[PDB]
Amino acid sequence: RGSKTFIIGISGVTNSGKTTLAKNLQKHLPNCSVISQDDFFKPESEIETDKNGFLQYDVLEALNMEKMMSAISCWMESARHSVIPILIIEGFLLFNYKPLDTIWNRSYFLTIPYEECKRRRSTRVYQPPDSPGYFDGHVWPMYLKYRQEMQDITWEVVYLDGTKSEEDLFLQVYEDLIQ
Ligand SMILES: Nc1ncnc2c1ncn2[C@@H]1O[C@H](COP(=O)(O)OP(=O)(O)NP(=O)(O)O)[C@@H](O)[C@H]1O
Ligand SMILES: NC(=O)c1ccc[n+]([C@@H]2O[C@H](CO)[C@@H](O)[C@H]2O)c1
Numbered sequence: 001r002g003s004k005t006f007i008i009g010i011s012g013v014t015n016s017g018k019t020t021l022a023k024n025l026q027k028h029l030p031n032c033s034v035i036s037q038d039d040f041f042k043p044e045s046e047i048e049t050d051k052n053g054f055l056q057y058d059v060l061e062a063l064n065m066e067k068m069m070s071a072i073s074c075w076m077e078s079a080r081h082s083v084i085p086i087l088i089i090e091g092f093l094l095f096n097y098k099p100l101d102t103i104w105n106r107s108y109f110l111t112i113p114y115e116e117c118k119r120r121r122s123t124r125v126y127q128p129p130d131s132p133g134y135f136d137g138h139v140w141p142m143y144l145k146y147r148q149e150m151q152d153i154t155w156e157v158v159y160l161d162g163t164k165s166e167e168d169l170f171l172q173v174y175e176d177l178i179q
């Protein structure tokens with residue numbers, strides 16, 4: 001209400017460079033906010049474990065999506081007071097969350113190969129840390145569950161090659177946005 005806004009969704013597999021891209025875009029766009037799905041995970045004490053003892057982090061049940069939706073709604077409610085306000089929402093599980101389907105003005109999806117994804121993942125320390133065999137046992141399977149949930153999407157998603165440099169990825173989205 002009350003002003004035009006421009007909302008960008010950036011999703012992709014874990015470690016595809018979503019957070020870096022969002023931050024880089026925010027540095028070079030005016031009146032630009034970023035909401036990161038990474039901020040809305042439940043604490044470890046509230047995460048489930050599956051039949052094989054893997055913590056269930058890579059599914060929407062691991063996140064406080066009411067709290068994230070609240071932050072997104074609040075951004076929208078307050079946008080007119082800042083004056084086109086831009087919101088980038090970035091996260092590994094966005095395009096399977098139906099309440100967001102109609103909000104996007106642009107949707108980007110970062111893809112990288114499994115080998116490169118696994119490589120990057122091993123360079124990270126999460127809290128809690130990835131348990132042994134977590135990536136093949138939980139992360140990649142859940143990522144494939146996501147991609148197939150995404151088969152029902154009716155809007156246009158722009159697939160981006162996340163093996164491009166951080167600067168190429170920025171530039172590619174930037175060029176798209178000013179068009
Ligand atoms: N375009 C890129 N090329 C090579 N490495 C990158 C690129 N973008 C990010 N990285 C590196 O990949 C790792 C993750 O980047 P980050 O921006 O956190 O990705 P993410 O998708 O937000 N990660 P996550 O939220 O944990 O699933 C870090 O080591 C980054 O320095
Ligand atoms: N941020 C967290 O609470 C947390 C904890 C454990 C694992 N992760 C990983 O973050 C990635 C996307 O942001 C997912 O693949 C999670 O496994 C996050």
Ligand SMILES: [Mg+2]
Nearest residue numbers: 018019020038
């Ligand atoms: Mg991130």
